[PDB]
Amino acid sequence: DDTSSSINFLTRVTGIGPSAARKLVDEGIKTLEDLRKNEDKLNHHQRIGLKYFEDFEKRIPREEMLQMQDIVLNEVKKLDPEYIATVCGSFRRGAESSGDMDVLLTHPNFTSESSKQPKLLHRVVEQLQKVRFITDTLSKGETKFMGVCQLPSENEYPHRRIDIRLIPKDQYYCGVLYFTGSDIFNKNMRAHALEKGFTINEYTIRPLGVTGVAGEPLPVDSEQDIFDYIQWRYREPKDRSE
C-alpha cells in the first residue's frame, strides 16, 4: 500500500537494503526527513548515501567523466607508473552520460598468487583524498573501495559515486572486459567462447574438456588476447553494444 510505498523509497538510499529497509519501517521511519532525524539508526554507509541522496540521483555527463578520468589517471601515475588504471562502465563504451565511476586498478606486484596488499589500493585512495577529489567513504576493503568524490570547483558539482577495485594482474584484462560490458555483449561473447571450447568469466578464460567440467587459466596480457583465444575480430568497446 501507500506504506509499501515507503519501503520503496528508503530502498532508494545507497545502504538501504530491503531487510534493512523493512526494520526501519518497524521503527516508524518512512520519509526522508524521518531518516535525517534518525541518523543514529543508520550505519556509516547508509549515512553518507542519505547525505547525498539528491546528487546521487543525477546522471554524469561525458565532459565531467572525462575530467574525472584525468585526475584519477594522473594521480595514480605519480605514485607509481607501474600501476594500470582503467575506467570501465558504459563510459568506456562511448556512453554520453554515466551514473558513477568505475575504476579498475592493477599492479604487477599483485597477482592472484599473492593475495594480500591493501596498501596498493589504500595508498591511491589516500592520494585522491589528499587532493580533495575523494570526499567520503562508504566502505573500504582490502581490495575494494566504494565512495564519494567531486570535481574541484573553481567558484559546484554534485558529488559522485566512485568505486575502485584492486584486481590481480593476471586477472585484470578479463575484469576490464567484464566491467566494460555491455551485458549482452558479455552474454554473446561467453556463448561464442563456449562454441570455441572455452569458458570465460570475470577473472579468467579456460579451455574446456570432456564431460565439460574442465579448466586451467590461459595467460591474458590484454583484452585482445581474449578475442584471439576465441578467434574473433577484436571489438573496440564502442562496438560492444551486443
What percent helix, strand, coil does the chain show, rounded to 5?
40, 15, 40
| Known binding-site positions for a 2'-deoxyribonucleoside 5'-triphosphate | 59, 90, 93, 99-100
d(CA 36, CA 29): 10
d(CA 161, CA 21): 21
140 and 126 in contact (C-beta within 8 Å)? no
d(CA 72, CA 85): 8
Q: Read off the C-alpha cell for 47.
A: 549515512
Measured at the CA of 56, the angle between CA 55 and CA 58, to 5 degrees, comes to 70
| Known binding-site positions for K(+) | 11, 13, 16
Q: Which residues 6+ apart lie within 8 Å of 124 measured at CB?
A: 75, 76, 79, 83, 105, 164
| Known binding-site positions for Na(+) | 11, 13, 16
d(CA 221, CA 84): 12
d(CA 35, CA 50): 8
Expressed in Å, this structure's resolution amounts to 2.5
Q: Which residues 6+ apart lie within 8 Å of 86 measured at CB?
A: 92, 103, 104, 105, 176
Domains belonging to the chain, first-starting first, are: 1-58 (1.10.150.20), 59-172 (3.30.460.10), 173-241 (3.30.210.10)
d(CA 178, CA 115): 21
Instruction: Write out the DSSP string of 39-73.
Output: GGGS-HHHHHHHHTTTGGGSPEEHHHHHHHHHHHH
Q: Is the dihedral of CA 72, 78, 81, 83 positive or negative?
A: negative
Cα separation of the two ends of the chain: 39
Between strands 101-106 and 160-167, the pairing is: parallel
| Known binding-site positions for Mg(2+) | 100, 102, 163
Distances (CA, A) of 235 to 18, 186, 189, 197, 203: 39, 12, 11, 20, 19
| Known binding-site positions | 11, 13, 16, 59, 90, 93, 99-100, 102, 163
Element (DSSP H or E) covering residue 206: strand 205-207
Q: Which residues 6+ apart lie within 8 Å of 182 measured at CB?
A: 90, 93, 240, 241, 242
Taking the CA atoms of residue 25, residue 26, residue 27 and residue 32 in that order, the dihedral angle to the nearest 10 degrees is 0
Backbone angles phi, psi at 125, to 5 degrees: -60, -50
How far does CA 162 lie from the centroid of its chain?
7
Longest dimension (CA), the chain: 65
d(CA 160, CA 231): 39
The single residue listed with the C-alpha cell 540521483 is 57
d(CA 30, CA 40): 15
d(CA 162, CA 48): 13
138 and 14 in contact (C-beta within 8 Å)? yes
Structural biology method used: X-ray
**Smallest Cα–Cα separation from 178: which of 205, 160, 196, 197?**
205
For residue 1, list its beta bridge partners: none
**Smallest Cα–Cα separation from 134: which of 143, 125, 144?**
125
